[PDB]
Design a protein around this ligand. Structure first.
Ligand code: SF4
Ligand code: SF4
Ligand code: SF4
Ligand code: SF4
Ligand code: SF4
Ligand code: SF4
Ligand code: SF4
Ligand code: SF4
Ligand code: FES
Ligand code: FES
Lengths: 583, 583
């Protein structure tokens, strides 16, 4: 490690080799504007915002990608720098459609914050913006080309982080635009509905498919009763919308606010989640005792199973036949609650507040229906629920707390930890150990693989006669790596591999509220969300295990008999088919 | 008091007579959109944004000015209400220029918040705007009629609370615009530079005169050294810009930030304020001992003295020849500091940070010059200081603290109370009692006059042979009332009256940062600012009395000789002439 000495603006510093002047000034309490810069993701120098005077330099240099050097002098407040920033913002703003009353981003468009910050009132230079081509055809992602700034963040994210890379650049000059391949639509190619591309864009050129009109139409029907259900991870970040500090639980406030909307029933996805935990435990027991297809993987997140269908069909024996916890609880409410309440199943409308955006495509699937009836009707993301609350506009900061409904709102901590990565797998191994060997484990040690961060390996003795190999995976690149190893066959001994496309778990999902870059250089939002969720876990004083909850025991005794029954297979078990690829 | 029962949205409530529905919903934790409503100021129903359904009503009614009645039923989320709100936003935005990148208000324009809140899709209803012209001619206030939406808050403020009313409405249809009288400019009529009209406008149609370009030109000069001057009320509300809670002191942080800006010298006005208090007290003693013109009034705030010379020339003999504390400090730096430092008086540039906007007109006055030299050069408000430091872009939330330079940065609590209501006169009577009778008083009981709030009276025995009558006034209507009473001669026995043009004192001045009506309904920002300033006063552990400060004693002994000297009169005392009126 080499030590570099540099002198800026009255202060000298020693830094390691590879240091950039930007985060060096950040550490030394100086801020420089950023558009195209992301920490360790997009470092190319296309933004052309961050100019600083360099001693001995013919012209200005961009501080974003500028490596430090020894003995240099840097001054950041010359008149040339200010004039260059003003003129360059005037140039770049002549393309972005200036009707900022109606952008979804609106208040936190980083371009708008820069525009106000530089105080550049006038725009002397006119122009002819590029062609307006609204791609309002796909299922989840909507693109608008009248806004895009060629920041290149979206393409870098979809190339590196997700290892999919269905976006590229075409043309030259004004003809240069970001497009999918073959001039098709997003849904016509192998897009995974990752949600990272829509969350990382600093302008609002991308938006999600809005179904709030359908929601208002559904709630407007007196003949239709509404069943709303909640994720464990909605209270992980929603408080950030209302100016609350990171890590606030508003669960009772959320229930009260949803009741003020006039929803007939409020409920949690937790109960069916415990049901499917019992499920995967049951076919674990079966595949152990019958030599089932191994290694086993879950079927929780729609995104990566979509990826497996699209790209690697050869692992289709390895998937779990179970349907998603969303799908489990949706079918459960549409059947058992309907039987108890003696109401026509078409007379219920079920709405879900989930953070994945891939569920928008997942609900559109033909085969996720029971008895020809829709298990769930409308799925919505956290951001658009927030805007629904804002258009209703109840002062959220003074709500009291409320409880959930019988029976399917009850909670357990091992099912609270669904929000973080591997909590599903933790609950599964804890429950199967409790069932088979009466073993009381709370946490599992994880082996961090050298050179790859985000992949986690574990192996704990479930029974003295059977030690189960455990692998955790989040991040599309990690999925690609572990799938390549699985095709190579070196994971033959492995038993469970848990996968989601979105890195860091659902707290880092596509439906989570938008955050800027500044807080990302400060604090990992994943870390604070995980701490808040784990603190919520430690406070669950009713049950830390799913199989001990009296509600799931009641349902199993009365209506579900045992898992892997013919009724259980017919209602909760499904098959998947490979999808045609257009790549 | 009559009790009214009303049943809204599933809950019944009792209110006193005259309690309209909006605050009834507010205390019941329900919010309704407001544009044209202000608490106790503007109740007219022009906005037509706050529509709510009423049982048995042919059409919708505006909740803003709708009185409650017994046995009514109110529904707030019918589809009719939503469609009406959406169409009225679509209509009203068709006139407001949609160039929201470069409004001064920008981020916190209430129209932007409403536009995002209602989630308006597009504006199909095109056309042309009203005729436009920018009156970029007045000294302080700048108008842009292309933006304004006929909220009528500005005209109500300038009519009621200021008792000036130089704004009105003209024309029919599109020709209906708010304008001054006789198609003139703002500076051509009896405008007082109140600043309330600037602070209260919820759209950004009004702004202050910007001189940041002159500031950057001045600081760019190496041949000119810069001395910056701070008012005590600057840190009363600066923190609100950076997301800090109400009542945060960043004084040392401000000193550090200013030093990072390249200012050569920093100084606090408390020294000159103490000198002015001594001069006023010496004039007190002289007019008592020589039968001077009574009652005594200050000459502190430029606004009200502008009002007096413009409207009531008969009060000139009752006025005090002393200049404003910032002006006296500027002259002192122009003469005594120049003598000590042996630097040519034109080679200094002095910039002042005032919460008044009337100082912009005040510095333009030709009579306020010493020896043909400009006492102070540039004055800027707190808001544009925030803008200049934001574009300077140092991360203000992690700055350490710094001290002020000698001998003119030292402070006393008697000068800390300068910004608060009545503190100047408090310090004056405390110091004169200390000088003449060695009387130790910390606070004086005040008589609140019945029927008028903001007019404040006291009479405590300064000496057993002389009790001084004490009156404090803030608010243009209160100024008008006390001036009318003075002309009637009812205040013959009175000795001191304070006149602050902006209501509530300079802590509520035009230079303070913009706040929204949501802030104004629940809490008075004046109250929290006064509490912060008084807590700062209680922590002043160096001196609670001006005349015990060694710095003022040194300057009086070495350079100022005795107060009310011929040199003191020639340097610190001035005459005012009546200005022609065009009303
Ligand atoms: S980039 Fe989009 S959100 Fe930002 S100011 Fe422009 S239109 Fe508004
Ligand atoms: S969406 Fe547009 S602005 Fe955002 S990264 Fe992609 S190309 Fe750049
Ligand atoms: S959804 Fe995923 S695959 Fe599709 S463009 Fe975005 S990041 Fe790429
Ligand atoms: S992290 Fe969450 S949103 Fe992302 S794929 Fe997994 S379950 Fe879906
Ligand atoms: S009213 Fe002014 S500040 Fe508000 S959006 Fe329009 S232009 Fe921008
Ligand atoms: S400044 Fe103009 S737009 Fe604002 S309230 Fe007054 S008249 Fe209406
Ligand atoms: S500065 Fe004062 S007098 Fe002039 S328009 Fe504003 S409120 Fe009225
Ligand atoms: S109250 Fe304050 S801001 Fe208003 S005129 Fe007086 S000193 Fe200036
Ligand atoms: S912000 Fe520095 S090059 Fe992008
Ligand atoms: S807020 Fe203006 S009419 Fe009600």
């Amino acid at each position: 490690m080499k030590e570099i000495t540099f002198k800026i603006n009255g202060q000298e510093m020693i830094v390691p080799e590879g240091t950039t002047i930007l985060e060096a000034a950040r550490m030394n309490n100086i801020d420089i504007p950023t558009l195209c810069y992301l920490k360790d993701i997009n470092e190319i120098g296309a933004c052309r915002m961050c100019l600083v005077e360099i001693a001995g330099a013919r012209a200005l240099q961009a501080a974003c990608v500028y490596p430090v050097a020894n003995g240099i002098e840097v001054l950041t407040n010359s008149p040339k720098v200010r004039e260059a920033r003003r003129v360059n913002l005037e140039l770049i703003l002549s393309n972005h459609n200036r009707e900022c009353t109606t952008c979804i981003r609106s208040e936190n468009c980083e371009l708008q914050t820069l525009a106000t910050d530089l105080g550049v009132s006038d725009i002397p230079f006119e122009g002819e913006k590029s062609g307006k081509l609204i791609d309002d055809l796909s299922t989840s992602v909507v693109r608008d080309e009248s806004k895009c700034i060629l920041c290149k963040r979206c393409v870098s994210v979809c190339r590196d982080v997700q290892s999919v890379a269905v976006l590229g650049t075409v043309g030259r000059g004004f003809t240069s635009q970001v497009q999918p391949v073959f001039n098709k639509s997003l849904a016509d190619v192998g897009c995974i509905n990752c949600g990272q591309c829509i969350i990382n864009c600093p302008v609002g050129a991308l938006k999600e498919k809005s179904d709030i009109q359908r929601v208002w139409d559904a709630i407007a029907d007196p003949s239709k009763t509404v069943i709303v259900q909640t994720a464990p991870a909605v209270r992980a970040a929603l408080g950030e919308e209302f100016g609350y500090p990171m890590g606030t639980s508003v669960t009772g406030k959320m229930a009260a606010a949803l009741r003020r909307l006039g929803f007939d029933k409020v409920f949690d996805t937790d109960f069916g989640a415990d049901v499917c935990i019992m499920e995967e435990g049951t076919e674990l027991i079966g595949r152990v005792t019958n030599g089932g297809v191994l290694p086993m993987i879950t079927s929780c997140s729609p995104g990566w199973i979509k990826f497996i269908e699209t790209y690697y069909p050869e692992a289709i024996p390895h998937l779990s036949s179970c349907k998603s916890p969303q799908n489990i609880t949706g079918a459960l409410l549409k059947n058992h609650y309907a039987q108890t309440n003696n109401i026509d199943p078409k007379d219920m409308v079920v709405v879900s507040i989930m953070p994945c955006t891939a569920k928008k495509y997942e609900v559109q699937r033909e085969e996720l229906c029971t008895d020809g009836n829709a298990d769930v009707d409308i799925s919505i993301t956290t951001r658009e629920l927030a805007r629904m609350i804002k258009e209703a506009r109840i002062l959220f900061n003074k709500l009291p707390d409320e409880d959930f409904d019988d029976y399917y709102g009850e909670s357990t901590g091992a099912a609270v930890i669904f929000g973080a990565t591997g909590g599903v797998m933790e609950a599964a191994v804890r429950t199967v150990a409790d069932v088979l060997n009466k073993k009381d484990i709370q946490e599992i040690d994880y082996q961090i693989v050298r050179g790859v961060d985000g992949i986690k390996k574990a192996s704990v003795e479930v029974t003295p006669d059977l030690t189960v190999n455990l692998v955790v995976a989040h991040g599309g690149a990690n999925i690609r790596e572990v799938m390549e190893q699985l095709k190579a066959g070196e994971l033959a001994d492995t038993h469970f591999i848990e996968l989601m496309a979105c890195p860091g778990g659902c707290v880092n999902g596509g439906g989570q509220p938008i955050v800027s870059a500044k807080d990302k250089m400060d604090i990992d939002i994943r870390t604070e969300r995980a701490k808040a969720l784990y603190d919520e876990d430690a406070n669950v004083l009713t049950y830390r295990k799913s199989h001990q909850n009296p509600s799931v025991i009641r349902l199993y005794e009365e209506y579900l008999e045992e898992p892997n029954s013919p009724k259980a297979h017919h209602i909760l078990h499904t098959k998947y088919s490979a999808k045609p690829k257009l790549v």
